[model samples]
Target: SQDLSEALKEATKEVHIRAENSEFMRNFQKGQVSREGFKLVMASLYHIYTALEEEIERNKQNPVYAPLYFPEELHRRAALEQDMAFWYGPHWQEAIPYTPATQHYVKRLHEVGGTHPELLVAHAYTRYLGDLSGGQVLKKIAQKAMALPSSGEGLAFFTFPSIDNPTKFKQLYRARMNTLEMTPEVKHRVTEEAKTAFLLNIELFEELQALLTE
Candidate 1:
């Protein structure tokens, strides 16, 4: 419902038209961001989204993990995936306009293509999440890349949503989970996957941030 086909006219328009252009996104694309600075930024985000993705797969399998356990905390994590998808899909290539910025961000992304072999390789450790979740986890990761704050070129990707607060989203999400039917065994499996996903993301970010930091 949110794709370009759903909103064709606006899809082709600059992403910034819908939201405030983030100077953070703008500067990062422009290569105005230092290597060390980028490392910290990536590290911070990597932790957030990784945890969010991991926990989501957890909730889907075991409704018990749903935010009735803790609304504000749960939704804050979930928002990472939602926000991630919106920005990356829209402005990834467009980030090129921040020129003389060396297009490092775009170039790195393209160096591997929309789906990176590395990410796939990394997911091998949690093939269960990928298989059971139907690529939602990876797709959301890419989406996070898109949602990152790019400036007026209309590519604002990751930030709080205009529609609802994280607390609200979590409450609604938990309510939906209550409708699902699953055995305790399956629920346990889901919880295991969520924990593993979090660890995997930590390793992924630490590795990537190390490279960027170096």
Candidate 2:
């Protein structure tokens, strides 16, 4: 494994592990979440990805982020929107607004995307890489739990249409990340930001669990 990529994985392993076994995630995996819970989960993810994809476009031209840009490969907002429409009907936007956790997560993305564009790479890595990784497992669990079609409709958020080989794509993605030029300090910041991204996701999961309990 490349040094930087390996370091990021090692540094965030604890949170990553913790997040995997988190109550919300465990419940999801066990098919314990209600249909409403799944809907809320999808809705919250829509908000998070909306911010992420928008900032990605905004930073696409930055010297630091431009090299890492892979819009067609990474874009998820439209897919998320399509999933929302499937689940919530045509006006899903009106039915499911952002939760407080989602608002906080989006705000964090905006802050970093606007002031510290380099950190956008960290968010992209945390999100897209995770999506390609365990996120795929989660997708299968979600589909089974929700009784979604096997054909991939209403599950666009978890599907990668362009990526036929996620394993190879991730290897290429890490290689691109390793080539990015930055000082030691920036690398540390990116690592920390990645950890923060995980925390944000865990918080969202906690929020959803609380909603389900209520």
Candidate 3:
């Protein structure tokens, strides 16, 4: 009976909590990590978003996905590029490499994109919506913690240049998402995929924590 957006929220709630409470996030929020450590986190995010946006492009034509495709307001691959360059210089492509956790996360995204293209909705909703929501808070924390400029150069990943009103844009996004017509079974599957997306994020955080400790 739940709308897709409502179901997604409910399904991902616990994993979202776990991710927010992860040691990596706790430390990052408290200014307990170095810029280098934060760069490590950004590296992993780079891989995830790369795969995510790529798949979004590949699936944008699907009738089920076309309605949700809002590339103008949601693209982040270029933003990640800017942040990567800031963090690792112009040779960031060679300098910053993906960790094992990032590799796994990227692999899962490709798998889902290839075999379950419809579920890309879950991935899109999970990443972009989170970026629009608590992601704003994280951006401020990152700016202060890393002593970055207010111009948002190094932290460009969190910036939404195309969206002038994030609150209104999010409502539009959810309204579009809710318009998706699907059977209850398919809705359930999407909910499960959303939860899987959150779990993948949590794993990335844990992996980063382990890497930071080493």
Candidate 4:
């Protein structure tokens, strides 16, 4: 059987390719998408980070989840991002602010799907991995999340699960897309923007693997 990290790596790679090649991201990068979508994606990713970062912190403190001591490992990832951000600027931190290029695609994605970057990330890793990870992915998340030790303030963002209410979750996603009001063609294009996000993120993950595994 594949290790957890390896499985995640493979999943990320697949998502990366899908995201980069998706028509949605291509048009989005070209300024064919709306500004609102881009902002939403940006905020969504930031929100995702805040959620996971806090979770990682929780895992760090909980002795029961010692095997899932992901905070330190994830921090290694944050360090890699710091370096990537430095390529563009010296003040780069772990959570680098969004770039205009990313914003363009993100905005379109948000507009069409009412999906934020954070939600997209969760969907890809948690929802999309149904086949590869075998339906246990979300359950894994719920289990891991519950194993953490923390006050509500730190992990509040990630406390909710849409697994039981997936239909409602998807409905909310569609509602966000409705706000964009693009033509059907463009709407289909924009809704698939997850492919682009997955690609950029996978590249980051690959870079992290190369750096940290040495």
List clash counts for every candidate, in order.
Answer: 13, 0, 0, 13
> What lDDT does the true structure give each of the candidates?
0.35, 0.86, 0.86, 0.38
Q: Please identify model 2 stretches exceeding 4 Å from their true place.
A: none
State the local distance difference test value for candidate 1: 0.35
Model with the higher TM-score, candidate 1 or 2: 2
lDDT of 4 by residue, 59-138 (tens): 43433223233232122234334323433345534435454444444444344234332233233333223222322333
lDDT of predicted model 3: 0.86
Q: Quote the positional error of residue 54 for candidate 3 in Å.
A: 0.9
Quote model 3's TM-score: 0.97
| Candidates in descending lDDT order | 2, 3, 4, 1
Candidate with maximal lDDT: 2
**Window of ten residues with lowest summed lDDT in model 4:** 126-135
The TM-score of predicted model 2 comes to 0.96
Write the residue-wise lDDT of candidate 1 on 80-104 in tens digits: 3333344344443333112212233
Order candidates by TM-score, high to low. Answer: 3, 2, 1, 4
Each prediction's TM-score against the native?
A: 0.35, 0.96, 0.97, 0.32
**Model 3 spans > 4 angstroms off:** none
TM-score quality measure for candidate 4: 0.32
Positional deviation of 148 in candidate 2, in angstroms? 1.2
